[PDB]
Amino acid sequence: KAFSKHIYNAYLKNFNMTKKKARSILTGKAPFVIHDIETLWQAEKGLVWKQLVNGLPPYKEISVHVFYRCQCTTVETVRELTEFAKSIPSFSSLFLNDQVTLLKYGVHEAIFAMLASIVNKDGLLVANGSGFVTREFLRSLRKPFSDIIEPKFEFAVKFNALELDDSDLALFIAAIILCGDRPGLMNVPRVEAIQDTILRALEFHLQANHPDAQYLFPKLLQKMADLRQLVTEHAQMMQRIKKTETETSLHPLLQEIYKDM
Numbered sequence: 001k002a003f004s005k006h007i008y009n010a011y012l013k014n015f016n017m018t019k020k021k022a023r024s025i026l027t028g029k030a031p032f033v034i035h036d037i038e039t040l041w042q043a044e045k046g047l048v049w050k051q052l053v054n055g056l057p058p059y060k061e062i063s064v065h066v067f068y069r070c071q072c073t074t075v076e077t078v079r080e081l082t083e084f085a086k087s088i089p090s091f092s093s094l095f096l097n098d099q100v101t102l103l104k105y106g107v108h109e110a111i112f113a114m115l116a117s118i119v120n121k122d123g124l125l126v127a128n129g130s131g132f133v134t135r136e137f138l139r140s141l142r143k144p145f146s147d148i149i150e151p152k153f154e155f156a157v158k159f160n161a162l163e164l165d166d167s168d169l170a171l172f173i174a175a176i177i178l179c180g181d182r183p184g185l186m187n188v189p190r191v192e193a194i195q196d197t198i199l200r201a202l203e204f205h206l207q208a209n210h211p212d213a214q215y216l217f218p219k220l221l222q223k224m225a226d227l228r229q230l231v232t233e234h235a236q237m238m239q240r241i242k243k244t245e246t247e248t249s250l251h252p253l254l255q256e257i258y259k260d261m
């Protein structure tokens with residue numbers, strides 16, 4: 001009852017952008033549309049970003065610049081997700097190496113679930129909602145960069161059909177991070193103990209918030225499974241980038257996440 005309230009606060013306290021904020025911008029009541037090099041360059045000059053251009057790896061080309069912008073956003077979400085996880089009382093009681101194991105495997109799964117909030121069929125929100133990058137522009141980048149984001153979109157449209165809100169997402173993301181199936185886990189029974197409480201809290205919240213919902217709890221358990229498949233494909237693509245594109249830098253933190261899978 002109070003656990004669900006605690007998880008939601010931790011979410012609101014740590015994430016820079018809610019699904020409520022993202023949806024109101026996407027619908028209305030105006031973000032700068034990025035669709036080519038001229039608008040992408042304009043966004044760099046005009047728009048206020050978190051990681052300033054000077055902090056990014058040295059300029060190479062358009063496709064690699066977008067890849068670098070994605071790389072920073074990923075790493076920053078990883079930082080926000082580490083603080084959110086710590087904010088769960090049970091999670092911080094686990095030995096730090098088990099905390100790392102959970103984050104090494106759940107992080108991209110959580111990222112893709114939250115990505116659905118800023119994503120629609122035609123593109124996604126950037127620079128704290130100030131800008132909007134089109135899907136066709138990402139489609140226009142050189143291979144393999146044009147092939148990374150496509151399965152995320154295919155997930156995001158199906159996931160947004162469930163119409164979940166920020167209080168549902170807080171528990172969904174919590175359940176993803178606290179997973180007992182992770183390789184190299186030391187105290188697997190304790191992580192399973194936390195997971196069960198989170199999943200029980202999610203079930204009871206999904207009836208209170210979504211009473212007319214047709215099978216919402218088992219649908220979200222299947223969505224967690226689909227998310228694991230999406231991360232596997234992502235690491236595979238990322239490993240291929242490291243072999244083929246031997247001039248584009250991969251952030252050491254992400255290189256470690258992808259190392260095994």
Ligand SMILES: CC(C)c1nnc(NS(=O)(=O)c2ccc(CCNc3ncc(C(F)(F)F)cc3Cl)cc2)s1
Binds near residue numbers: 040144149
């Ligand atoms: C090559 C490309 C398809 C990709 N490279 N890595 C990917 N990585 S990903 O894991 O799909 C991912 C995608 C998008 C975000 C926010 C992006 N944030 C963005 N921010 C700014 C711009 C820019 F520069 F165009 F304005 C574009 C995007 Cl997509 C976070 C993770 S997709």
Ligand SMILES: CCCCCCCCO[C@@H]1O[C@H](CO)[C@@H](O)[C@H](O)C1O
Binds near residue numbers: 103
């Ligand atoms: C393999 C996955 C491990 C990832 C851990 C991400 C950790 C969040 O670690 C952090 O980074 C910031 C600056 O670099 C700080 O301002 C925060 O107090 C902080 O805890």
